[PDB]
Structure formats: C-alpha cells, structure tokens
Design a protein around this ligand. Structure first.
Ligand SMILES: [Zn+2]
Ligand SMILES: [Zn+2]
Ligand SMILES: [Zn+2]
Ligand SMILES: [Zn+2]
Lengths: 200, 200, 200, 200
DNA sequence: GGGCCGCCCGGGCCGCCC
DNA sequence: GGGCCGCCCGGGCCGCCC
C-alpha cells in the first residue's frame, strides 16, 4: 500500500470545503491566500486561519487532521519535517514535537501523531460545529519552517491535506491547498500569480 | 476545544446591548467611544462607563463578565495581561490581582477569575436591573495598561467581550467592543476615524 | 558619605584614558561614539568595544570596574537598573544577574557586584596589559536596556564610569562617558550633534 | 581573561608568514585568495592550500594550529561552529568532530581540540620543515559550512587564525586571514574587490 | 557564465514635554 | 493643544537553476 496520503479532493456527503480570509498582498502580510493558485502564502510561525465549511453536521466525535506532503512527484515519498536548525530552536509550545512542521494554536485538545508505518506527522483537533448564526469553524495553523529552509523543505512546495474523519476512522471529506512559507507573502503571491498569467 | 473565547455578537432573547456616553474628542478626554469603529478610547486606570441595556429582565443570579482578547488573528491565542512594569506598581485596590488588565471599580461584589484551562483573566459582577425610571445599568471599568505597553499589549488592539450569564453558566447575551488605552483618546479617535474615511 | 559614585575624570599617575572605535553614523549602526559629546550611542545587547589606554603599566592584580549612574542631578541618587520587562527576559548568559544593565562579554573572569550599602550594580574584570606591539586593551560591554525603557531608565541619560583599581582598592584612574542605548544610534548621534551646534 | 583569541599578526623571530596559490577568479573556482582583502574565497568542503613560510627553522615538536573567530566585534564572543544541518551530514572523515568547521585533510597526525574554558574548536598538525629545495610547507584545510549557513555563520565573516606554537605552548608566530565560504568564489572575490575600489 | 528569496536599509509614522 | 524614539515599510541587495 502507498505510504503517500492521497491529496484528491473529496468534499463528500457533508459538503466539506475550506475557506480563507481575504488578506490582500501587502509585501509582508503575515498570511494571504490565492484562489487562482489554491495556495496559502504565510510567514514562519505566524497564525494561518483556515475555515471549515460543511453543508451537513458531522457526527459527534469527528476529527480534523492536517498533514503536509511534498507537491512534486519527485519528492512525494519524502516525509515533510522541520529542518535541523529550527528543530533545535527553543520554540516548542510544550505539546508539539520539535520535528513537526504544522502546529495548531489555541486548542485545548490538539494531538500530534507520528505514523508508525509511514513516519509522517499530523496534527488533529476535534471538529466543533459553528456557533449559532455562524457558517464555519476556524482553526489556527502555524508552519514552523520556511519553504526555503536548508535541510528541510529546501524550496520544494508542499500541500497541506485537511481531512474530516469520524471517530471510527472513516474519511468523511478531504481538501488540500498548496503552501509557501516565506518572508514576504504579499510579494510572492503577486509574483506567482503574475507568472501564471504571463507564462502558465 | 478552542482556548479563545468567541467575540460573536449575541444580543439574545433578552435584547442585550451596550451603551456608551457621549464624551467628545478633546485631545486628552479620559474616555470616548467611536460608534463608527465600535471602539473605546480611554486613558490608563481612568473610569470607563459601560451601560448594559436589556429589553427583558434577566433572571435572578445573572452575572456580567468582562474579558479581553487580542483582536488580530495573529495574536488571539496570547492571554491579555498587564505588562511587567505596571504589574509591579503598587496600584492594587486590594481585590484585583496585579496581573489583570480589566478592573471594576465601585462594586462590593466584584470577582476576579483566572481560567484553569486557558489561563485567561476575567472580572465579574452581579447583574442588577435598572432603577425604576432608568433604562440601563452602568458598570465602571478600568484598564490598567496602555495599549502600547512594552511587554504587555505592545501596541496590539484588544477587544473587550462582555457576557451576560445566568447563574447556571448559560450564555444569555454577548457584546464586544475594541479598546485603545492611550494618552490622548480624543486625538487618537479623531485620527482613526479620519483614516477610516480616507483610507479604509 | 555619598551614595553616588564620583564621575570626576582622574587620569592619574598611570595616564589612564579610554578609546573608542571610529564607526560612523549609518542610521542603525550597532555602536558609535561622539567625541564632541563624550557619548556612546549603541543598540540594546550589542557589543560596545571600549579601549583602555595607559602610559604606565598598572600593578599585578589591577581591576577594571564599570558602573552606571544617571547623569542629571535630579536622578543621580536612583540606582540604574534594568526595567521589569527586560529583567524577566530569558537573556542571561548564566553569570550576569538579570537586574544588571551593564554586562561584559567574552571574559572568563567577570564578576558582578551589588554594593551592600548603595545597592548599585557594577561589573569587574581583571586588567590585562596589551599584547606586545599593541597600545591598548579592549573590553566588550553590553547594555541590556534602551535608554527609553519604561520602568527603567525611562529616557534619562546615564554615565558609564570606568575605574582602574588596584587589588587593595586604591583608585588608580577614573574616566566616564555618556551612554544612549537606542534603536538608531547613527540617527540619534547626528541629531544630538546637530542640536549641539544649532542650540547648545 | 579574554575568551577571544587574538588575531594580531606576530610574524615573530622565525619570520612566519602565510602564502597562497594564484588561482584566478573564474566564477566557480574552488579556492582563490585576494591579497588586497587578505581574504580567502572557497567552496564548502573543498581543499584550501595554505603555505607556511619561515625564515628560521622552528624547533622540533613545533605545532600548527588553525582556529576560526567571527571578524565583527559584535560576534567575536560567539564560538564559530558548523550549522545544525551540516553537523548531521554523514561527511565525517572519522577524525573531525561533526561540529568542527575547519578540517585538515591528508595528514596522519591531525588533532581536533575543544577548549575546556572557551569551548572553541581548533585543529592542529605537527610543523614539518620544507623538503630540500623547497621554500614552504603546505597544509590542506577544508571549511565544512558556507559563510551563509542558516544556524551557523549566517553570513557573518570569519577570520582563520594560524599559530605556530612550540611543544611547550609558546607562541612562535601568528597570522590570520579572512574567509568566505561560498558557492561562487570567483564572482564573490571580484565583487568584493570592486566594491573596495568603488566604495571602500 | 548568465541570471533568478531572506533580509538589510533609510524614510517616515504615541507617550509625553512645553 | 502644539509638537517632539521604537519600529513598520516597500525598494533593492548568494545558493542554485539553466
Ligand atoms: Zn527551518
Ligand atoms: Zn503596562
Ligand atoms: Zn528594558
Ligand atoms: Zn552549514
């Protein structure tokens, strides 16, 4: 069986999709999302709000998992991890293992997992339905390396795969988006969108 | 579950809303409220009158809680607290813990709380209905740091979240407003309203 | 007896004077010295090289002490200390008490002292004569607060007093210089020198 | 006493000086030396031949030590070491500790040392006099990180300090040169020499 | 050899003195 | 009320792809 998790969109029977805030492209905005590229541009260790939208209410005990894979076929089989420099940084919140790229902040029930067969990292929180009058629930993710980090992602693009899973382990829905963690998200989003228009 | 309290307005079945006095924008007025920005501008440790308005009378034992959160997504998970300088100031009224930003003055039944899971501070008083002939009840809040304080809010905007809660802990209503604690509330309100008009 | 150490220059029988490197006034240079003002401009926690020049060799066991006092008569009696914010910072090198403003880096025999009568802080290293062919010895000082720090120096200028002391405690020589610890030493040096010329 | 080794040239009673090969400035030459800058430009882990020249023959048991320090006063006190990424690389020759920046290749009597007081690294070989008819002896040094390495030198220039020491520990001579380890030594030497001419 | 991403840089934007 | 210091900001400056 494959050791590479699927990235295939599966909005499923609950109508699961992601949403992202409108942030603009000021040069050093902390986080911004390109709909044309389905790509988040964000700064190291800065809050990245991701909205969970469903048409139908998931069952009690549903979980939300996030995991990173390399986007390019050439690198898919390599586990996405923090680089050695940032791994040794004294920046752990007391729960995230220092090797994990993706953290969740602001959640009292976060779980960090290492797959015993694929060695891949993931971070899980319970799914909570929106407040009355609200249409979505927001998770604050953090990416703890730049895409460029030597000895880590080393300029290779990643996908974040968000899965909605019931307590039994059934896949209720899947979505994914590309991530670039970089110093100047607004500059780099504009550059990549312009290159898409000019040369894509 | 989230460690960030919701800011979502919930005027609820009792028709709960806040009111603020008309104060003007003389440069150093002690407290002034901008309806356009839903924002209070006030000076450190000065009285900030907040009115509670309801259409229907809350049940006996209802309580009024105030808590601060950072407004920006990037800072929401950080607990709002006093800076180290003002924390060591001998300005405690004998009841407020020195780390708490928000105090209530002039109430014999004030309670200061530290959440055992989120570590967030709040201050609670009993809800009292208006006097006959009066349409609202007023609480005098104090903010014990400037928004700019180094090692505390450090120029980051906060929201104050006011909740009306029954004795059992049900949320009866919720309102919130932005706060800037600053040396010159009248100047800064005018500046922010003008920037809204010109560049918002 | 006075609790304020003397600032009076005493170059003494060994011909003791200080020297400073030529650094220029690029806006954010880390450290720069104004001869006209006898004033060092430097950034928080950045190396400040100070040269010790003597005409005659001090005796074995000579010590070099540095201490800060407020320059203005109105503040001389207050002990110069780190502000509460930086005092709680996890920036101690394992030897300097967190309250001390002045540190010495790169010396295996540094001693930090608190005066039991005046409560004033000082930092001492052994005097070592220059290498053959060299005319001076250099100490790397660090200032661990900005001059502007709220709850610390709070925009008040300080003097650093450097004393050459024999092992018995005799004062062999004294020199002093003004210090401004600031974000932009080059800007601020130029500003202060221009104000001296225009308005001094 | 200082934890920073002296860089002061001391050609001494044996007339000790260094020599470097003429290599040119082809863009990616592996190693090239700028006399104007007293600076070696070389690639990671590539051979850097350094010549030892003496006028008088050192005594038996003389040793040659190489050590790196940061050139800028602001960084002198920090120990120069390999970055975390290259430290975990399986590139050890069986003798050099993985944390050491400077290695010697091609010598059966190399010794790697960690100073118990300063924690600084050095690498030592016995001094051997030139062959009859030869005027110098050559040591092949290797630098195991780029000057730019994140978490290591991080774009900060270093000096290599070469000391000639007798077996008793007397300093017989000292020389030093700046090093830049980089991808394109020929480009970067030309750039730095041109900037010296134009803006130095 | 030509040329394409983190960070440095001078310009300019909130408590307190007058 | 007028006006005088830390930090944000867009412009632009080294390993690696071609
Ligand atoms: Zn990293
Ligand atoms: Zn404060
Ligand atoms: Zn301070
Ligand atoms: Zn390296």
């Amino acid at each position: 069986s494959s050791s590479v998790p699927s990235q295939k969109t599966y909005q499923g029977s609950y109508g699961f999709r992601l949403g992202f805030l409108h942030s603009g492209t000021a040069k050093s905005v902390t986080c911004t999302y390109s709909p044309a590229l389905n790509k988040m541009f964000c700064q190291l260790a800065k809050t990245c709000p991701v909205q969970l939208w469903v048409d139908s209410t998931p069952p009690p005990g549903t979980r939300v998992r996030a995991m990173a894979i390399y986007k390019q076929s050439q690198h898919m089989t390599e586990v996405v991890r923090r680089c050695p420099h940032h791994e040794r940084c004294s920046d752990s919140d007391g729960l995230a293992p220092p090797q994990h790229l993706i953290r969740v902040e602001g959640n009292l029930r976060v779980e960090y997992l290492d797959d015993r067969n694929t060695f891949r990292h993931s971070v899980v929180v319970p799914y909570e339905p929106p407040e009355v009058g609200s249409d979505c629930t927001t998770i604050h993710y953090n990416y703890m390396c730049n895409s460029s980090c030597m000895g880590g992602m080393n300029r290779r693009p990643i996908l974040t795969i968000i899965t909605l899973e019931d307590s039994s382990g059934n896949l209720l829905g899947r979505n994914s988006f590309e991530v670039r963690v970089c110093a100047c998200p607004g500059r780099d989003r504009r550059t990549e969108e312009e290159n898409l228009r000019k040369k894509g």
